[PDB]
Structures are given as structure tokens and as C-alpha cells.
Design an enzyme around this catalytic site. Structure first.
Site, PDB file in Angstrom:
ATOM      1  N   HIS A  41      45.147  42.147  45.479  1.00  0.00           N
ATOM      2  CA  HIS A  41      43.670  41.656  44.971  1.00  0.00           C
ATOM      3  C   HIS A  41      42.682  42.723  44.005  1.00  0.00           C
ATOM      4  CE1 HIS A  41      42.276  41.243  48.981  1.00  0.00           C
ATOM      5  NE2 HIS A  41      40.917  41.865  48.112  1.00  0.00           N
ATOM      6  N   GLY A 143      34.227  45.389  52.067  1.00  0.00           N
ATOM      7  CA  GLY A 143      34.635  46.694  51.663  1.00  0.00           C
ATOM      8  C   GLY A 143      36.193  47.253  53.104  1.00  0.00           C
ATOM      9  N   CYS A 145      38.492  45.397  53.145  1.00  0.00           N
ATOM     10  CA  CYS A 145      40.219  44.924  52.386  1.00  0.00           C
ATOM     11  C   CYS A 145      41.177  46.241  52.809  1.00  0.00           C
ATOM     12  CB  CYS A 145      39.972  44.496  51.641  1.00  0.00           C
ATOM     13  SG  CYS A 145      39.794  43.259  52.172  1.00  0.00           S
TER      14      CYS A 145
HETATM   15  C1  LIG Z   1      38.392  42.395  50.842  1.00  0.00           C
HETATM   16  O1  LIG Z   1      38.692  41.895  49.646  1.00  0.00           O
HETATM   17  C2  LIG Z   1      37.547  43.452  51.070  1.00  0.00           C
HETATM   18  O2  LIG Z   1      36.636  43.954  51.388  1.00  0.00           O
HETATM   19  N1  LIG Z   1      37.622  43.737  49.244  1.00  0.00           N
HETATM   20  C3  LIG Z   1      36.425  44.392  49.009  1.00  0.00           C
HETATM   21  C4  LIG Z   1      35.000  44.663  48.815  1.00  0.00           C
HETATM   22  C5  LIG Z   1      34.444  42.581  48.988  1.00  0.00           C
HETATM   23  C6  LIG Z   1      32.968  43.176  48.442  1.00  0.00           C
HETATM   24  C7  LIG Z   1      32.378  43.474  48.274  1.00  0.00           C
HETATM   25  C8  LIG Z   1      32.438  44.190  48.102  1.00  0.00           C
HETATM   26  C9  LIG Z   1      34.405  45.393  48.744  1.00  0.00           C
HETATM   27  C10 LIG Z   1      37.687  41.174  51.367  1.00  0.00           C
HETATM   28  C11 LIG Z   1      36.972  41.642  52.849  1.00  0.00           C
HETATM   29  C12 LIG Z   1      36.759  40.463  53.723  1.00  0.00           C
HETATM   30  C13 LIG Z   1      34.954  40.072  53.584  1.00  0.00           C
HETATM   31  C14 LIG Z   1      34.569  39.211  54.285  1.00  0.00           C
HETATM   32  N2  LIG Z   1      35.052  40.225  55.374  1.00  0.00           N
HETATM   33  C15 LIG Z   1      36.142  40.233  54.723  1.00  0.00           C
HETATM   34  O3  LIG Z   1      37.302  40.375  55.801  1.00  0.00           O
HETATM   35  N3  LIG Z   1      38.199  40.523  51.531  1.00  0.00           N
HETATM   36  C16 LIG Z   1      37.821  38.875  50.048  1.00  0.00           C
HETATM   37  O4  LIG Z   1      36.574  38.981  50.313  1.00  0.00           O
HETATM   38  C17 LIG Z   1      39.206  37.852  50.248  1.00  0.00           C
HETATM   39  C18 LIG Z   1      39.365  38.049  48.235  1.00  0.00           C
HETATM   40  C19 LIG Z   1      40.641  37.134  48.577  1.00  0.00           C
HETATM   41  C20 LIG Z   1      41.861  37.226  47.744  1.00  0.00           C
HETATM   42  C21 LIG Z   1      42.140  37.071  49.439  1.00  0.00           C
HETATM   43  N4  LIG Z   1      38.626  36.183  50.241  1.00  0.00           N
HETATM   44  C22 LIG Z   1      38.117  36.128  51.159  1.00  0.00           C
HETATM   45  O5  LIG Z   1      38.069  36.905  52.531  1.00  0.00           O
HETATM   46  C23 LIG Z   1      37.349  34.187  51.169  1.00  0.00           C
HETATM   47  C24 LIG Z   1      36.880  34.662  51.913  1.00  0.00           C
HETATM   48  C25 LIG Z   1      35.415  32.675  52.124  1.00  0.00           C
HETATM   49  C26 LIG Z   1      36.126  32.310  50.382  1.00  0.00           C
HETATM   50  C27 LIG Z   1      35.548  30.713  50.399  1.00  0.00           C
HETATM   51  C28 LIG Z   1      34.935  30.275  51.718  1.00  0.00           C
HETATM   52  C29 LIG Z   1      35.292  31.019  52.949  1.00  0.00           C
HETATM   53  C30 LIG Z   1      35.416  32.269  52.684  1.00  0.00           C
END
Ligand SMILES: *[C@](O)(C(=O)NCc1ccccc1)[C@H](C[C@@H]1CCNC1=O)NC(=O)[C@H](CC1CC1)NC(=O)/C=C/c1ccccc1
Ligand SMILES: *[C@](O)(C(=O)NCc1ccccc1)[C@H](C[C@@H]1CCNC1=O)NC(=O)[C@H](CC1CC1)NC(=O)/C=C/c1ccccc1
Lengths: 306, 306
Positions: A41, A143, A145
Site C-alpha cells: 500500500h 508512520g 507501517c
Molecule cells: C500505515 O499505513 C502507515 O503507518 N502508513 C504511513 C502513514 C500513515 C498515515 C500518516 C502518515 C504516514 C498505517 C499504520 C496505522 C495508522 C494508525 N496506527 C497504525 O498502525 N496503516 C494504515 O493506515 C492502514 C492502511 C490500510 C491498507 C491497510 N489502515 C488502517 O490502519 C485503517 C484503520 C481503520 C479504518 C477504518 C476504521 C477504523 C480504523
């Protein structure tokens, strides 16, 4: 003596963390030899996430759509493929800090250490267990991920987890290092819920053995039980059924303490039925299930305080 | 989201651990630049320990009385002195992995990460707090002496603890990196007991703020309290008195949540008086005191889940 949730020393993993950027999305990746692994992603934008088609989204990128940074240094990408829910990026330089390693898919109830990472820079380390419902109770922010989970045996790092998402209840989900999710989850920004969880019975018992190795016997009793009688009580307290294989795994701990397993099961059954009566075990007021039998042998003395 | 006892990534410290042997005694030491630091009792034999005279015991050794091993490599000692309860051994090679570092003496209530080590080889990492009675609740076996505690800020390692002993109650005691003990303890194999301990009030409050940042408000109430009224309840529950300086330290957390400190104190007072009524906070059934206000800001989101 003492007993603590201990993680593996994190050094070998620290030297493998990088930053991976694609468009506006930055997350962490893992640099072994000349490959970098990251969540697929990273190619998505806000728009794409409700319903991405990764094959479609990926064919539209080139090698230079990806920026890899190891500290100060930009690594040049020269190859890219998707493996299940990860990308593998071929790079021009082989990581000189690559440890000896393997990739394993860990089983429910097993434990590993997580190296929480932001912008390719390690932030913290903690131990957790893969829950029976295929989640982990982590601590992860935007951040995180690409943060990895691992075990260390005899200078070989066994990677087992890469981080991808947080569920509505605040627990965390991700993949092994071939990109296959743990549990029924998918990498889409949709509504998914953890299945109902259970207590990991085998680990509770292993920790009661630890409490005895460390010199505490208060919760023991003169009874014994059959498996089956144990299991009827287990179901009522939302504990996993115990099996003969689990009984056998507890052999070594049983021998070190001279307490037969089914005797420790009677002890547990009595604790479930009567409470702890304001007492503690290894400092806890609750029954702990995030230590395996292996975790107990590794940390506790090989001689009982009898 | 989530909340865990997290330790600092251990890599920078791993590359400084060595083995130090003198006679029959082997323990761990810490190699920065061209000095190795270790507990001074490495010079003692069984016989010496009830009542050692270290000055007398040390004048009888030479440089070659000490064997230092960094992995496979023997380091040659070329100098030795005693600083309080440590030895400083001058060696022929400067550690190429020496990080940026400092030595600090940490205060009661502060937290650090411990790198448990055996035979100079790192075994595990965990976070703990310096207790008010100047002990730590570690996990340490024979061979762990010389294991260090530390904090990391902006690529600078602040060493603050070296391990020396276990007390009869199973808790642990040692020194800062100038060899001064934390607490009234001495490095003799005699009878010493931890003083009575107290709960670290400031940290309990900081953790309740974490629970609110992470979106839980259940334990709040409409009351407020004065300091003094708070403190009469504190004494009865063996909590440290809260002071105005502690109130001020909680400012930033107070502002992020919009909950005034004395309002969170009323919340705490009510929890001490009435229990938690089978409920949990950040997953715990007990009030946690091993996170500082700093630990909370570092790990929690900078935006409240309101
Ligand atoms: C990682 O994608 C991540 O850290 N990405 C980089 C980033 C994200 C946002 C701002 C700046 C950089 C996310 C890690 C999550 C965020 C909160 N704590 C974590 O563990 N992952 C996601 O955001 C993830 C992406 C989806 C493709 C898999 N989605 C979710 O975690 C969704 C959560 C959700 C959706 C709907 C209702 C409730 C929770
Ligand atoms: C360290 O000295 C250590 O690890 N030394 C190396 C070593 C010791 C034993 C076998 C092989 C190698 C000891 C670490 C302790 C041991 C158990 N857990 C630990 O944290 N430290 C000591 O043994 C220490 C030496 C004293 C000079 C300071 N003494 C104690 O810990 C005494 C404990 C005691 C004495 C009397 C009653 C109850 C407890």
C-alpha cells in the site's frame, strides 16, 4: 531472579531499517542483501484505499517511482515485483549489515519482539504475542507501517511480522515476510473487525511454572484433574482447550519443578473458579498469557528455588 | 494507538558489551573509547566477599590479572584504577562502535532500559523504573553483573545503571557509571534489605492521561480537590505526596487532554477509595506507575482521540 516481558536485543534488526517513499506516502522497509521489503500500500494514495486494485495500481509505476533511503544515503531501485501484500524492491547495493536470517510464519500463541519504526528510524522495542484471533496488541502510530517483528536464535534473525494496519478496537494486523496476512484481514481502508479472542491456556500454565521456579507455591493444591474435566471449566472461562500435545510441551518445566501438568491444571481450575483472593503471582494480579514455555525456560533459572 | 512498556532500541549498547575475567570470576563490562568499566567485585573470590577490603584486594593485582574479551578478540589491559564501586580498565584498542554518550545519575521515579547480558553477550532488553527505595524490579541471573541501564536521546546514549546485586526479596541494586550505588547498599555478600517502597504518584497520573489521549474517559468525575486533601488520601494508600512541581510537569498532558491536574487527582482519589469495579485502564486492572510523563509524550499520539 525476577520476571519481565523481555524482547530480543534489537541491533541486528536496526541495521536493516530503511524509508520507502512513493508519491506522497512514506513508510518503513526492510533491507536484506539487495532486496527491500515493504507494504504494498505504499503505492496507494488517499483516493486508492477504499478499493485498490494493486495489480492495476502497480503496472503504472516504474523503478524510479520509488525512493529508498538508508540513513543519509539514497539507494537506487533497479527492479520491482509484488509478492502477496508486499513489494520487493531490487536495489543497486547489498546491505553490508545484513544479519544471518530466515523468514518464518509464526503460529497463534507464539511470541516475538517488534521494533517500532518511523521514517526508517527505530523508535522502540517490545514483546508481544500473536493472539488466537490473529491480532497483536501493539503500540503503533501513523508512520509505523513496515515495522517488523522477529525472534533471534543463535545469531540467526527469524523475521515473522510486518506491520500494515490498526483495527477499530485499537489492535494491530499485518503479514509474514512473504506478504500473507495473519488472519482474515485485507489491506483496504474498509470495516474489518477482529474475531473474538481467547486466553492462551498453554502460556498461562507455563507462567505458573515460572512462578514456582522463582520460589512461589501458594496457588498449588492437593487435587488433580482429567483433561476433559479441565476443558469443561476452560470453555466457561473463554480459555483455549488444552490438548495432549500441550501437556507434553510442558514436560521439561514439569520435571524442573516436580509438579505434574494435570496437578498444575487443578491449580489453574481452582484459580479460575475462586479468584486470586487479593494475592499476586510473579507480581501480577491477573493470569498472564503472553509467555510461552520457551520464553519461561530462556529467562528463568535452570534451578528451582525449592 | 495501544500502549506498551517499550525499551529503547539496544543496538548502540550491544556494540559496547565485553567479558571481564579475573581469576575464577567472569562478568560483563562496558567498552567505550579505550576504557572498560565493570563492577569492582570481579577481583573477589568466594572467600573475599563477606568482608572485602577492595583497596587491599586491588593493590595485589596487575594489569595482566585481567582478561578482557570483545567477541572473539582479546583486548590487552594497560592500566587499572578503582572508581568508587567500579574498576576502570585501560585497554590497547579504542572501541570502534563507541556511540555518542554521557553518564547520568538518574532520579527515583525515572525510567530506563536494561540490556541483560551474560558472558559479554546480550541476551534481552526491558524497561524498568528506579523505585523510590532505590531498587529496580529486574530479571537477572548469575552472570548478569556488569549489565547496563540506559536512555537514548537524539543518538546520544545516556548510561545510568550498572548491575551488581540481588536482594533477599528478589529485587536488584547497583550503581551509576561513576560507581556510586543507588540507595544505602554496599557491595559485600551481607544481609541488606530494601527500605519500604511507595507508589510513584506522578507516573500514575501520567498514565491516566495516556488512557485519555487514547480515547478512554470512564474513570473521570465532576469533582476537583486541593493538593492537601489529595495528599491526605495519598498517605493512606502509600502513594508519594504530590507537589506543585509535579503538577507543573503534567502541564503539557493537561493541555493536550483539556483535563486540569487537580481534576485528574480527584479522579485518582476516587479510584483509590472505590476501586476500579472490575474495569480496566489501558488494558490493566491495576494502577500503573512505571511510565513517566516523558514516556507518555514519546509513545502516545500528539492528538487526543476526543
Ligand atoms: C500505515 O499505513 C502507515 O503507518 N502508513 C504511513 C502513514 C500513515 C498515515 C500518516 C502518515 C504516514 C498505517 C499504520 C496505522 C495508522 C494508525 N496506527 C497504525 O498502525 N496503516 C494504515 O493506515 C492502514 C492502511 C490500510 C491498507 C491497510 N489502515 C488502517 O490502519 C485503517 C484503520 C481503520 C479504518 C477504518 C476504521 C477504523 C480504523
Ligand atoms: C553478580 O556478581 C554476577 O552475576 N556475578 C557473576 C557470577 C555470579 C555467580 C555465578 C557465576 C557468575 C551477581 C548477580 C546476582 C546473582 C543472582 N542475580 C543477580 O542479580 N551478584 C552477586 O552475586 C552479588 C555480589 C555482591 C558483591 C555485591 N551478591 C548478591 O547478589 C547477593 C545476594 C544475597 C546475599 C545474601 C542473601 C540473599 C541474597
Amino acid at each position: 531472579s525476577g520476571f519481565r516481558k523481555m524482547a530480543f536485543p534489537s541491533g541486528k534488526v536496526e541495521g536493516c531499517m530503511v524509508q520507502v517513499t512513493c508519491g506522497t506516502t512514506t513508510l518503513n522497509g526492510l533491507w536484506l542483501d539487495d532486496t527491500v521489503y515493504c507494504p504494498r500500500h505504499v503505492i496507494c494514495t488517499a483516493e486508492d484505499m477504499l478499493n485498490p486494485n494493486y495489480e492495476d495500481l502497480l503496472i503504472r509505476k516504474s523503478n524510479h517511482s520509488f525512493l529508498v533511503q538508508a540513513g543519509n544515503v539514497q539507494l537506487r531501485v533497479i527492479g520491482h515485483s509484488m509478492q502477496n501484500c508486499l513489494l520487493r524492491l531490487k536495489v543497486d547495493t547489498s546491505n553490508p549489515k545484513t544479519p544471518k536470517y530466515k523468514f518464518v510464519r509464526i503460529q497463534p500463541g507464539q511470541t516475538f519482539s517488534v521494533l517500532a519504526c518511523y521514517n526508517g528510524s527505530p523508535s522502540g522495542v517490545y514483546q508481544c504475542a500473536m493472539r488466537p484471533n490473529h491480532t497483536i496488541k501493539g503500540s503503533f502510530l501513523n508512520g509505523s507501517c513496515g515495522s517488523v517483528g522477529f525472534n533471534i536464535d543463535y545469531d540467526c534473525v527469524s523475521f515473522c511480522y510486518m506491520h500494515h494496519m490498526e483495527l477499530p478496537t485499537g489492535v494491530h494486523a499485518g503479514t509474514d515476510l512473504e506478504g500473507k496476512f495473519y488472519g482474515p484481514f485485507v489491506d483496504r481502508q474498509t470495516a474489518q473487525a477482529a474475531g473474538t479472542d481467547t486466553t492462551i491456556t498453554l502460556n498461562v500454565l507455563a507462567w505458573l511454572y515460572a512462578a514456582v521456579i522463582n520460589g512461589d507455591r501458594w496457588f498449588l493444591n492437593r487435587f488433580t484433574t482429567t483433561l476433559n474435566d479441565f476443558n469443561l471449566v476452560a470453555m466457561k472461562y473463554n480459555y483455549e482447550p488444552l490438548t495432549q500435545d500441550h501437556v507434553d510441551i510442558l514436560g521439561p518445566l514439569s520435571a524442573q519443578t516436580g509438579i505434574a501438568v494435570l496437578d498444575m491444571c487443578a491449580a489453574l481450575k481452582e484459580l479460575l473458579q475462586n479468584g486470586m483472593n487479593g494475592r499476586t503471582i510473579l507480581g501480577s494480579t491477573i493470569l498472564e498469557d503472553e509467555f510461552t514455555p520457551f520464553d519461561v525456560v530462556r529467562q528463568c533459572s535452570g534451578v528451582t528455588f525449592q
